[PDB]
Amino acid sequence: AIPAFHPGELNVYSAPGDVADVSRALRLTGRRVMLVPTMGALHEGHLALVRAAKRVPGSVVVVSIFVNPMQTPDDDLAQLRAEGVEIAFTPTTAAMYPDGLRTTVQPGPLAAELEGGPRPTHFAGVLTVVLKLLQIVRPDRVFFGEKDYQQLVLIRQLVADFNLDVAVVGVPTVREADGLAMSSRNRYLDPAQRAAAVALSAALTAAAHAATAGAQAALDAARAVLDAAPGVAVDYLELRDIGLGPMPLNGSGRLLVAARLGTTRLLDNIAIEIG
Amino acid sequence: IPAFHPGELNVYSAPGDVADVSRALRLTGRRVMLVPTMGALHEGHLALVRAAKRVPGSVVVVSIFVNPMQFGAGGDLDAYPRTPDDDLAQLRAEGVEIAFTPTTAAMYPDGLRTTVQPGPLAAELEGGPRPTHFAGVLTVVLKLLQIVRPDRVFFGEKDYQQLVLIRQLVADFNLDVAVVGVPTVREADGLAMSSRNRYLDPAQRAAAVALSAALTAAAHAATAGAQAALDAARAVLDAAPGVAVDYLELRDIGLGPMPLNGSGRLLVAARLGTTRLLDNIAIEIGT
Ligand SMILES: COc1ccc2c(c1)cc(CNS(=O)(=O)c1cc3ccccc3o1)n2CC(=O)O
DSSP states (O other): OOOOOOTTOEEOOOOOHHHHHHHHHHHHOOOOOEEEEEEESSSSHHHHHHHHHTTTTEEEEEEEEOOSSSOHHHHHHOOOOOEEEOOEEOHHHHHTTTTOOSSSOOGGGHHHHHHHTOOOTTHHHHHHHHHHHHHHHSSEEEEEEEEGGGHHHHHHHHHHTTTTOOEEEOOOOOOOOSSSOOOGGGGGOOHHHHHHHHHHHHHHHHHHHHHHGGGHHHHHHHHHHHHHHHTTTTEEEEEEETTBBBOSSSEEEEEEEEEEETEEEEEEEEEEEEO | OOOOOOSEEEOSSHHHHHHHHHHHHHHTOEEEEEEEEOOOOOOHHHHEEEEEEESSEEEEEEEEEOGGOSSSSHHHHHHHHHHHHHHHHHHHHTTTEEEEEOHHHOOOTTOOOOEEEEEGGSSSSTTOOOOOHHHHHHHHHHHHHHOOOOOOEESSTTTHHHHHHHHHHHHHHHOOOEEEOOOOOOOTTTBBBBBBGGGOOHHHHHHHHHHHHHOOOOHHGGGGOOHHHHHHHHHHHHHHHTTTEEEEEETTOOOOOOOOSSSEEEEEEEEETEEEEEEEEEEEEEO
């Protein structure tokens, strides 16, 4: 007996078993199931993921809201209802981990670099939960922001390596008017910090344009912009190929930066074409 | 979809081919059964095939893939029995419609990268001196389940620790598959069927009956408690020539962080010359 699903309405499920049943039932009636995993506290970046999912013809949008211990509820639900989303999946920690921590995903060596330097088991947690969510919902496509680019690349590796049957859709970073990448962390910045934070996106965009003049020009331009900001402690600034291997001589790449402003760690990244 | 001819053995090497065929069969109302194997098929494997066949409306997929990732040294890997002609002939005789025989390059085109890390059971018993062994098994089994997407997957109780680890895999990753354990098939004297039995010379084959004798002796001794069951098994192993015991352990049926109660599993590993044999049996304690 399938749990109740009311079409055109926000249906909220906490039991993984229930959302599994509704998703399968929906797949069998011609819906294309789109998954948008979130950690709640939704903002415009999250709504951009929702909107991208919503525009696939015959889509039903599943938004998961799960605070992963290994990696405003009513506010959030009203936004989704406002976006015309039909399923929120809101499971408990116990429901996700009924046997506690046991079998897990071990990321490849990319997980040890960049963000995996300050947080070396962060990515295992993320990939473990994403794999679980994929298996519960069995979506046709799953949506992630390019904001967390290294995470996104690790998810693409998960999907490839485990032969998962889902398309991974990366959605361009939603930005404030001055270019700052949207993030929940942005609200912790004092005005001096928030004005200085603009150096991350400014550096990366300056780098993307300088790149007609080569990889070195691109990197030196980004470094100059970051060097013009006070109180911006750069953790890394790295040019890599699109899959985060070493940057090819010329061609397509990604430039990633991370910096601490007071106690707030900020990240950004951008597409780079070399020459 | 590639060609699929019902009532005939259809052999696919490309993951995409078997995946497409499987999905199309499921969408037609057939139930897809998977029996993951490392080839060198013997009567133990045919029991799994038979169990799968008797699921009504089943189409049966047997995979044959000697998985490098669950082997320690390349030495082990090169020595593994490969008899693919006997394998396919046995599958034909059993009425299996799909054999899935992937290449190493197709399964691991990027080498080792994202893997499954099993829970702490993978470090005990067989996993003790082989710390990456069960990671290798769970990784390839996860991949096979995702490629084939079966309704049910069949594993022998012979490799009992493996079966338990697969059940954990399936629970913890929320996989939508039923795991079916099939009772150990035995030779007339009680010897558990195994691809390793071929390495026993005549003396060794004679001595090897001691494992199953010891376990069945234990299961009946167990009315007198755990110590009696254990000491019965040990006496029988000790009375056998050229049988070096590696472990003999009585655990809970889940083999887990839980004390043995009424129902347990008695597990043995022993060396005959260079050949390492395993067996295990259900044990009820104080009956
Ligand atoms: C499209 O424009 C943007 C811009 C910034 C964005 C996003 C989109 C999305 C995010 C954060 N990712 S998430 O909360 O949806 C998430 C949920 C989840 C669940 C399980 C595992 C990993 C998971 O990751 N951010 C940045 C941020 O909020 O810091």
